[PDB]
Amino acid sequence: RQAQISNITAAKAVADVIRTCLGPKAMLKMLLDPMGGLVLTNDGHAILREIDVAHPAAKSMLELSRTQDEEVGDGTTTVIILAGEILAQCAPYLIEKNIHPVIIIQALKKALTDALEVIKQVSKPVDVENDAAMKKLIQASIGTKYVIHWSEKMCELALDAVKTVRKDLGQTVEGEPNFEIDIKRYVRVEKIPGGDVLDSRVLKGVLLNKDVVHPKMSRHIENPRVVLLDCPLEVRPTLVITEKGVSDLAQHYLLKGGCSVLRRVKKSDNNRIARVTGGTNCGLFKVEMIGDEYFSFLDNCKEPKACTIMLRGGSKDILNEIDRNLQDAMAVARNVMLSPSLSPGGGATEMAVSVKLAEKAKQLEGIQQWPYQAVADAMECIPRTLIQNAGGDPIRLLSQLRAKHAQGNFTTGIDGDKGKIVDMVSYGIWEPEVIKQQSVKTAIESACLLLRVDDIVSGV
Amino acid sequence: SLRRDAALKVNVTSAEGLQSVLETNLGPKGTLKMLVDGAGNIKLTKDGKVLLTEMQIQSPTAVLIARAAAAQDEITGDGTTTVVCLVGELLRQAHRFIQEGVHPRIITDGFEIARKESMKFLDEFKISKTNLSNDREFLLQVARSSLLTKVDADLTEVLTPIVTDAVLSVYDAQADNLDLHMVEIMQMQHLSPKDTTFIKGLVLDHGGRHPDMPTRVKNAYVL
Amino acid sequence: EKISGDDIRNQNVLATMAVANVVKSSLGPVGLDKMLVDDIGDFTVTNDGATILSLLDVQHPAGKILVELAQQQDREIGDGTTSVVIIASELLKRANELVKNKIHPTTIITGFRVALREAIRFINEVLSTSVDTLGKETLINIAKTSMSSKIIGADSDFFSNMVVDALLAVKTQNSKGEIKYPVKAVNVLKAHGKSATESLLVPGYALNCTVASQAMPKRIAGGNVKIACLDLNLQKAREAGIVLERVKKIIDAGAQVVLTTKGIDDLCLKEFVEAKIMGVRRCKKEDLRRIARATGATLVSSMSNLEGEETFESSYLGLCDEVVQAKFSDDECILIKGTSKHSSSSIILRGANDYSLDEMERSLHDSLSVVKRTLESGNVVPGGGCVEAALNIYLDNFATTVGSREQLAIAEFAAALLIIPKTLAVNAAKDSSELVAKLRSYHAASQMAKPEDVKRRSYRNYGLDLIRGKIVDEIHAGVLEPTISKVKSLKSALEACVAILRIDTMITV
Amino acid sequence: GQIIKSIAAIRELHQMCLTSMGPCGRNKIIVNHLGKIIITNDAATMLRELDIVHPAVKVLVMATEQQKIDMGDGTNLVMILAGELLNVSEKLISMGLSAVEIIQGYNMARKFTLKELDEMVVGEITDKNDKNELLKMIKPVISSKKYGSEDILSELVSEAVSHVLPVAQQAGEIPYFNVDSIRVVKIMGGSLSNSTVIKGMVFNREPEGHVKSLSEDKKHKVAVFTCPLDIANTETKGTVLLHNAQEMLDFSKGEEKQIDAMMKEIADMGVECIVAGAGVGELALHYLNRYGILVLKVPSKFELRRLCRVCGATPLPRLGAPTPEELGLVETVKTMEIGGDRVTVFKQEQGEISRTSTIILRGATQNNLDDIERAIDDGVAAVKGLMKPSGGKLLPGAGATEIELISRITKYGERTPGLLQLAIKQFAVAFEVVPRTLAETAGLDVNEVLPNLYAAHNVTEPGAVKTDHLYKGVDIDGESDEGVKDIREENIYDMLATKKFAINVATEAATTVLSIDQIIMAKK
């Protein structure tokens, strides 16, 4: 039974340290490196990567933070703390009560479905087609950053950036595609120095920096046809694009054929060209120079769900700050398109599940009823952690907040600025449901895997 | 079976040790500290930032204190020791409130609220001085503030006209700015510090060696 | 150093105890995964007990014997390695207890060898082929429990009847009456027609394609029809005189069904209208290779062989009954039944959307894998503890028939088999003391009237179901194991146990 | 964190009492420093034979004696419940809830429990004092102590109680049953089936005379003499000495004539039994055999007190003055062989109803013989609980009471707003130790019986009024069973006076421990 305690305390010590990283009031942390430097930032994703751990269960929690950070921008520490508290509340049940671990694991699988159904009832509908409403939802990830001066322009740029990659399609014939939104590959951006932030537009297609290889050639084609190939030159298409370079000999041979030669094209861009091409039905071939650099337009009249966003600004340092800020802003807007629902923040959603779980578990009357109380207590620790960071009494503010759910609504959370129980909807505090769905599901799934290992095998 | 860790009692105390060191040398009545490398290097400096670069501190609390002065020398250029005294003493005054159960966020947020209110009182307390070039008589007393701090005040009267006339000679009267890079500092030993004088031009290293070279030449052409 | 005496015998028990604890929690499907950490600091996550023993680092003369024992079961059977280590571990613990009883190790070894030969004979008496096909259902519960982790498991009750009946007739003599089921057969299609429960079993080959121009009749040659499998296209070759000669050899050969991988042109299609020949455009190459074996035809590489050009009439034409095209919703397929020799069939799954059918088609092949492996061996035995529990009681009364200091070795050998159902119920959270005890009570009265060839309430083959937490027959529950797996696992487990007990001295420089 | 370690020190002794309560319980052998082995199953008696180190444990020991002195039953319920109240409070003390509001929560939960105890009464004892009616109260008392003797000892204890109680009804002014009315004696040999019930004290000593027993005459006169039998002399000194052989014949014959003259006046008054608390001379036993007077010597002053309440005899400070006013009357006294040895017992017939009885025990096991001696004493205090303070009311036992209180307390938890909800919920969970202890010691799985106990008292009935079976308790099994069984079959009930008194003592016991945040000690 000693191995079960070591498996719990492995993720328990890591979770207890990052408890102060949750919320806008999160306290700063200080790590001591062997070098004279130190890490003063409170970001949980940066701190967990610099911590060296021994027990392998702590390494599994670090891999969960890396996967959670790729899906959504924030809420990385919420998943680790929630998964660590479940093992702490189930520690006396697994050890002192002598309960079989699969019974706890089987109960967590049933509690995972019940936790998702409560969040769907607490969530409220939202209009995803309103352009003015989406700018306010993204604004939560805009303000309190260097882009606050451009926040008016950032909300418009991040709006068209999300609307570009997404495509709305649904039916019962081929199923639900879920819009097939990918931020990494498809929303990948190319930074162009110079220009203006307001003038920056989102173009659908692949942007190349190579110009025409011939001095006299047509710069505008009615119906251009893009053709991709591998082997360099050294159907009668209207354009010829080569991945590698093209010798000057092939320039005159293809000149009489009425096609343009374009060399030096990256391999990663050729995969995205197949989305806009497959080259018929190509909208605009215009090569017009922008920012003292010759460009090319592969765009069209269609929505392939693949593109390269053109970013412009006052300098390269400005584009570097917009880069990581735009990806975090689109992650919040992406969760809005995954479903037209929003959940109250500040711990209101965390308390809404704990209240409904305790009432539903009493009607089951089974062996799984006991670990449900441990899950309900773990759901209350997330808003209680913010109370400890807000200076308020964690004993008094937790009991008074739980009693209000039985009378009032489930949208009443805790404010970071004030520190007293207040309503999230009226005071303008909102969070998407997808973060709540990924926080509960991944924490329970990771907590079950840690309890499945009763022995640590040493060997190669 | 486990509740928190209380923490603290390590950063405040470590910052109190740095305060007691830099409390004695602050101001014109301060003391002149001496550091020893061990290779034969001996430097006597009353500035806080200059000494922190030659001292290695294992405590990470004092590391950020030395890094906080990095923006002070590149912008303000003076008062690096005064800033450290305000950081250390603020922790001692807040130490009594932490033991009483006051949460540090209210202590932290209470400092930012008082900081914004201090900026409003800062603009009312300041005095606007004209840009006219007749203020050189008033600039003599202003230059003494920086001079009297780093010396024993015996060399202040000698260095007062040198520092004052160095900036005003290269500065025409307009908004513009002043560039201190055009002022070069050279040193030669085997002489007393009271012989320091002001040089309008540039000093050259290698001089002409010959008995018949004229010592004084008036109104000469440079080629 | 040189050691001997009771010290080396105690180290052999402590060595196999730590090895058994590694595979103790991994036994059975209810087992749980473990982590293997090296000195580099990396780790791995797997639930397979065979891969754990391969990377398990143990320094011990008897411990390395179990390492080679684990590799012997993987290179041959590939399954049951976890159960072999547990059996050999309990035999060493009970053999060391006989040292204080003044029992000689050779008698312990001889007592196992004599009992092992007689145990296989008793196992061969309860072996039976596939039964309960009429009046009961066996193979149905196999696909039901395997699909319980997928959405298809809800409708798997209706879907299992189509898979079991199909595969039942797929068996053929192969080479000299082998009766070995193929690893890949019954190509599964998809359609949007109606709901998921409306899927119908088609007793025959089914190809997904259309007739292109509808001017051709969909049903022709009811009595007899010949299907022509041609990889070479009838379309104009990139020229008009060659493609007309290829069609001339078709209508003259009497082939009412023509399959072309690259399609058929419009000019060559007009000749098929007057001859009532059904053409198909854009055939799949992977589909037509199986048609040659199902319809008795042969894939035609090219018509340019030697100096002649022709389709080799009657040589590549297979015997079939009738080719009829039934109207289906969404995509329409082709029904081919009554060929020369097929014995196979096809399953067209109709459902709401293809998103769910993609998960059902992949789960169907995974569920079919468990079915085809069990049916591969015509001689099977019920598992779930039926082998260890039934043999435990039989060796109790049989141990008296031998005697002469060997009865104590047989009694300890039989009681050592109860550890398999014991540790199996540990991962299921069920009490292992009550299940193993009550399991012996049911088999005790079951073998009393067995040799009398008369029975009333006496039934054999009681298993252990850990999913529902009750004692039921594993034959009807869907848990079956081949004879090759159990015989080689029990015989090889004793081979490694003997070599450990024969070492009285360890010499290490 | 001494308040946590103080609970851990009690936790070491908590598991000791968990192995006591219940039919699986067992006595503990303790060897005293004087070389005496005391063996008893009762945990309250064991606490007096154990050396207590931590002074915080003595608080629970002093609270345990409160249960034994007054009610005499439920000592295991007080110590075990008080130990669990500290474990459920350990989570509250750590959670950050102050121990002040923890104490305030128990005071509010205690008043809510006392009001519900009056509504949980099912049956009521009519105090008929019938032999069959006493079998319902005595059976659970013998239960959870010694197994297999509950059927035999039920008829032996209930028979001795009906002998000392007069015939009365609906009168609570004058008390009748005391704690000394039942004496327990033991003798080697025999079994429990051969044991009988005596209506009076039993003397296992020898008569010390040639007269084995008296006659069958009605109302035998018994006289208790504190002065020893000898010639009357001066109270101060008065040592008989012989100076010469001439005074030898006068002093020897003088003692013969003086004693015979005093014994003649006693026999003429009709006194056939003389009780001498002091030693008896040689010449005294010779005259008592001719007059047919039974010789009885009781040096213990405690046995003489219960004898005066039966026949009515009084001890006389002098010798030779048989005052008939202070003499006692016994119907029948006989000397019979019970248990293999001939002993002279004391009993009655009709008149002069005895207020004190003695039960004779027989058995071949010496260890179990002393265990029954301590088990009957716990049954004596059970009869005392039949008085006016809720003597007739009863509550279902065998774990049915502690589980049913969970649903009623949690119902009042959400009703009372504020921080008291933390202590109210933990107060009901602390009652789960009683059913878990009986299930764990019986070998039953916690994952099996425990979830069936919660589903027994909590069901969904299509109606406002409760129905189906509310009598389902905790079953020890031991052979086989499915689920639980009804308690009304075996008629195992707990008195309200015992259960209500045990809750208030256990509440104040845990209140004292939680209120102490510091302990100051000094070496001796």
Measured in residues, chain B has a length of: 223
Burial D337-347 (b: 16+ CB within 10 A, else e): ebbeeebbbbb
**Backbone dihedral angles phi then psi of residue B37, each to the nearest 5 degrees:** -80, -40
At D40, which helix (H) or strand (E)?
strand D37-40
Instruction: Return the structure tokens found at D466.
Output: 């409760």
Distance, in Å, from the CA atom of D232 to the CA atom of D321, rounded to the nearest integer, reads 12
Q: Strand runs (DSSP E) across A24-88, as ranges?
A: 31-32, 38-39
Q: What angle do CA C133, C136, C140 make, to 5 degrees?
A: 75
Contact residues on chain C for A458, CB-CB shorter than 8 A: 36-38, 57
Q: In degrees to the nearest 10, what's the CA dihedral of D474, D476, D479, D483?
A: 20
Q: Which CATH architecture has domain D1-124+393-524?
A: Orthogonal Bundle (1.10)
Q: Is the dihedral of CA B199, B202, B207, B213 positive or negative?
A: negative
Of the candidates C449, C475, C448, C477, the residue with the CA atom closest to the CA atom of residue C461:
C475
- Chain B touched by A391 (CB under 8 Å): yes
Distance, in Å, from the CA atom of C383 to the CA atom of C477, rounded to the nearest integer, reads 10
Residue C275 DSSP class: T
How many helices and strands, by DSSP H and E, does chain B display?
8, 2
Distance, in Å, from the CA atom of C42 to the CA atom of C35, rounded to the nearest integer, reads 10
At A400, which helix (H) or strand (E)?
helix A394-407
Question: Exposed, middle or buried by CB within 10 Å (0-12, 13-18, 19+), for B123?
Answer: exposed
CB distance A260 to A212 below 8 Å: yes
Instruction: Return the structure tokens found at B212.
Output: 């018949």
Task: For tokens 């039949």, name the residue.
Answer: D386
Which residues, including other chains, have CB under 8 Å from residue A148's CB and lie 6 or more apart?
Answer: A142
The alpha helices in C196-308, defined as continuous H runs, are 240-251, 267-274, 285-294
Contact residues on chain D for B3, CB-CB shorter than 8 A: 94, 96
Strands D220-225 and D328-330: antiparallel
> Taking the CB of residue A161, how many other CB atoms lie within 10 A of it?
24
Residue B100 DSSP class: T
Task: Count CA within 13 A, CB hemisphere, residue C192.
Answer: 11
Q: Which of D96, D414, D454 sits opposite A395 (nearest CB)?
A: D96
Distance, in Å, from the CA atom of B115 to the CA atom of B18, rounded to the nearest integer, reads 24
Which residues, including other chains, have CB under 8 Å from residue B58's CB and lie 6 or more apart?
Answer: none
CB distance B27 to B149 below 8 Å: yes
The alpha helices in B37-182, defined as continuous H runs, are 48-53, 60-68, 70-71, 80-99, 104-125, 136-150, 156-169
A/D interface, count of CB pairs below 8 Å: 32
Contact residues on chain D for B103, CB-CB shorter than 8 A: none
Beta bridge partners of D494: D395
> Taking the CB of residue A238, how many other CB atoms lie within 10 A of it?
21
CB distance D164 to D356 below 8 Å: yes
Which residues, including other chains, have CB under 8 Å from residue C167's CB and lie 6 or more apart?
Answer: C181, C185, C186, C368, C371, C372, C375
CB distance D219 to D351 below 8 Å: yes
Instruction: Return the structure tokens found at A424.
Output: 């999230």
Amino acid at D6: S
To the nearest whole angstrom, how far is the Cα of A101 from the nearest Cα of chain C? Answer: 8
Distance, in Å, from the CA atom of C505 to the CA atom of C496, rounded to the nearest integer, reads 17
CATH code, residues A205-299 = 3.50.7.10
Which residues, including other chains, have CB under 8 Å from residue D122's CB and lie 6 or more apart?
Answer: D394, D395, D396, D471, D493
Q: In degrees to the nearest 10, what's the CA dihedral of A310, A314, A319, A325?
A: -100
CB distance A18 to A32 below 8 Å: no
Distance, in Å, from the CA atom of A42 to the CA atom of A25, rounded to the nearest integer, reads 10
Q: DSSP for A104-151, please give it.
A: HHHHHHHHHHHHHHHHHHH-EE--SS-HHHHHHHHHTTTSSSGGGTTH
To the nearest whole angstrom, how far is the Cα of A98 from the nearest Cα of chain D? Answer: 8
**Backbone dihedral angles phi then psi of residue D493, each to the nearest 5 degrees:** -130, 160
Q: After which residues is chain D broken (C to N over 2.5 A)?
A: none
Measure CA B49 to chain center.
Answer: 8
Report the interhelical angle of D446-457 vs D400-413 (nearest 10°). Answer: 60
Q: After which residues is chain B broken (C to N over 2.5 A)?
A: none
Strands C188-191 and C346-350: parallel
A-interface mutation test, from D454, D457, D461, D484, most A Cβ less than 10 A away:
D454
Q: After which residues is chain A broken (C to N over 2.5 A)?
A: 234, 278
Distance, in Å, from the CA atom of D248 to the CA atom of D252, rounded to the nearest integer, reads 6
CB distance C136 to C476 below 8 Å: yes
D-interface mutation test, from A102, A363, A365, A407, most D Cβ less than 10 A away:
A365
Query: Under the phi-then-psi rule, with left for phi > 0, alpha for psi from -120 to 50, and beta for the rest, what region is C179?
Result: left
Distance, in Å, from the CA atom of D135 to the CA atom of D137, rounded to the nearest integer, reads 6
A/B interface, count of CB pairs below 8 Å: 19
Of the candidates D353, D354, D220, the residue with the CA atom closest to the CA atom of residue D293:
D220
Instruction: Return the structure tokens found at A200.
Output: 């920056």
Measure CA B183 to chain center.
Answer: 18
Strands A31-32 and A38-39: antiparallel
To the nearest whole angstrom, how far is the Cα of B1 from the nearest Cα of chain D? Answer: 7
Instruction: Return the structure tokens found at A300.
Output: 């069209």
Contact residues on chain B for A391, CB-CB shorter than 8 A: 102-103, 105-106
Residue A287 DSSP class: -
Neighbours, chain A (3 or more CB pairs < 8 A): B, C, D
Distance, in Å, from the CA atom of C335 to the CA atom of C227, rounded to the nearest integer, reads 12
Measure CA C452 to chain center.
Answer: 36
Distance, in Å, from the CA atom of C352 to the CA atom of C202, rounded to the nearest integer, reads 20
**Backbone dihedral angles phi then psi of residue D49, each to the nearest 5 degrees:** -95, 0
CATH code, residues D125-199+352-392 = 3.30.260.10
Instruction: Return the structure tokens found at D28.
Output: 């503990």
To the nearest whole angstrom, how far is the Cα of B3 from the nearest Cα of chain D? Answer: 7
> Taking the CB of residue A404, how many other CB atoms lie within 10 A of it?
15
Which residues, including other chains, have CB under 8 Å from residue A216's CB and lie 6 or more apart?
Answer: none
Burial D33-69 (b: 16+ CB within 10 A, else e): eeeeebbbbbbbbbbeeeeeeeebbebbbebbebbbe
Task: For tokens 């025959």, name the residue.
Answer: C204
Which residues, including other chains, have CB under 8 Å from residue D365's CB and lie 6 or more apart?
Answer: none
Instruction: Return the structure tokens found at A227.
Output: 């053709």
Q: Which CATH architecture has domain C1-130+379-509?
A: Orthogonal Bundle (1.10)
Q: For B194-205, what is the HEC assignment?
A: HHCCCCCCCCCC
Q: What angle do CA A292, A297, A298 make, to 5 degrees?
A: 150
Distance, in Å, from the CA atom of C407 to the CA atom of D387, rounded to the nearest integer, reads 69
- Select D200-351's CATH number: 3.30.2350.10, 3.50.7.10, 3.40.1280.10, 1.20.1330.10: 3.50.7.10
Residue C258 DSSP class: E
Active-site entry in A9, A76, A78, A308: A76
Cβ <8 Å between C21 and A455: yes
CB distance A302 to A281 below 8 Å: yes
Cβ <8 Å between A390 and B2: no
- Structure obtained using: cryo-EM
Contact residues on chain A for C354, CB-CB shorter than 8 A: 174-175
Amino acid at D252: S
> Taking the CB of residue B176, how many other CB atoms lie within 10 A of it?
8
To the nearest whole angstrom, how far is the Cα of B5 from the nearest Cα of chain D? Answer: 13
To the nearest whole angstrom, how far is the Cα of A100 from the nearest Cα of chain D? Answer: 9
Distance, in Å, from the CA atom of C22 to the CA atom of C85, rounded to the nearest integer, reads 10
Task: For tokens 């044991």, name the residue.
Answer: D195
| Interfacial A residues in 36-65 facing D (CB < 8 Å) | none
Domain ranges of chain D: 1-124+393-524, 125-199+352-392, 200-351
| Interfacial A residues in 321-380 facing C (CB < 8 Å) | none
Of the candidates D475, C496, C381, D447, the residue with the CA atom closest to the CA atom of residue A103:
D447
Tell me which long-range contacts A127-134 makes (C-beta under 8 A, separation of at least 24): A127/A340, A128/A336, A128/A337, A128/A340, A131/A159, A134/A159, A134/A162, A134/A333, A134/A336
**Backbone dihedral angles phi then psi of residue A161, each to the nearest 5 degrees:** -70, -40
CB distance A56 to A456 below 8 Å: yes
- Chain A touched by D458 (CB under 8 Å): yes
- Chain B touched by A30 (CB under 8 Å): yes
- Chain A touched by B10 (CB under 8 Å): no
Report the interhelical angle of D75-95 vs D421-429 (nearest 10°). Answer: 140
Helix, strand or coil for residue C349? strand
Contact residues on chain A for D451, CB-CB shorter than 8 A: 365-367, 369
Task: For tokens 């994952």, name the residue.
Answer: D447
Residue B207 DSSP class: P
Distance, in Å, from the CA atom of C3 to the CA atom of B209, rounded to the nearest integer, reads 96
Of the candidates A24, A64, A21, A68, the residue with the CA atom closest to the CA atom of residue A44:
A21
Task: Count CA within 13 A, CB hemisphere, residue A409.
Answer: 16
R_g of chain A, CA atoms, integer Å: 27
Distance, in Å, from the CA atom of C186 to the CA atom of C199, rounded to the nearest integer, reads 14
Beta bridge partners of C219: C324
Instruction: Return the structure tokens found at B210.
Output: 């010959």
Measure CA B200 to chain center.
Answer: 25
Contact residues on chain C for A103, CB-CB shorter than 8 A: 429
How many helices and strands, by DSSP H and E, does chain C display?
17, 16
Distance, in Å, from the CA atom of D449 to the CA atom of D436, rounded to the nearest integer, reads 9
A-interface mutation test, from C19, C27, C33, C37, most A Cβ less than 10 A away:
C37
Question: Exposed, middle or buried by CB within 10 Å (0-12, 13-18, 19+), for C143?
Answer: buried
Distance, in Å, from the CA atom of A261 to the CA atom of A254, rounded to the nearest integer, reads 7
Q: What angle do CA B20, B25, B27 make, to 5 degrees?
A: 120
Distance, in Å, from the CA atom of D235 to the CA atom of D255, rounded to the nearest integer, reads 17
Strands C505-507 and D328-330: unpaired
Distance, in Å, from the CA atom of A90 to the CA atom of A370, rounded to the nearest integer, reads 9
Which residues, including other chains, have CB under 8 Å from residue D476's CB and lie 6 or more apart?
Answer: D22, D23, D24, D438, D442
> Taking the CB of residue C405, how many other CB atoms lie within 10 A of it?
14
Distance, in Å, from the CA atom of C136 to the CA atom of B162, rounded to the nearest integer, reads 113
Cβ <8 Å between A458 and C57: yes
Q: How far is CA D373 from CA C335, D152, D358, in A?
A: 92, 14, 12
Contact residues on chain A for B63, CB-CB shorter than 8 A: 36, 38
Beta bridge partners of A285: none
Q: After which residues is chain C broken (C to N over 2.5 A)?
A: 238
Query: Under the phi-then-psi rule, with left for phi > 0, alpha for psi from -120 to 50, and beta for the rest, what region is A180?
Result: left
Active site residues of C: 48, 81-82, 366
Residue of B nearest to D4 (CA): B1
CATH code, residues C131-202+343-378 = 3.30.260.10
Distance, in Å, from the CA atom of A414 to the CA atom of C305, rounded to the nearest integer, reads 84
**Backbone dihedral angles phi then psi of residue D359, each to the nearest 5 degrees:** -105, 130
CB distance A389 to A414 below 8 Å: no
Amino acid at C167: L
Distance, in Å, from the CA atom of A423 to the CA atom of A400, rounded to the nearest integer, reads 14
Q: Strand runs (DSSP E) across C308-373, as ranges?
A: 320-324, 333-339, 346-350
Domain ranges of chain C: 1-130+379-509, 131-202+343-378, 203-342
Residue of C nearest to A452 (CA): C32
Distance, in Å, from the CA atom of C293 to the CA atom of C273, rounded to the nearest integer, reads 28
Report the interhelical angle of A76-89 vs A369-379 (nearest 10°). Answer: 140
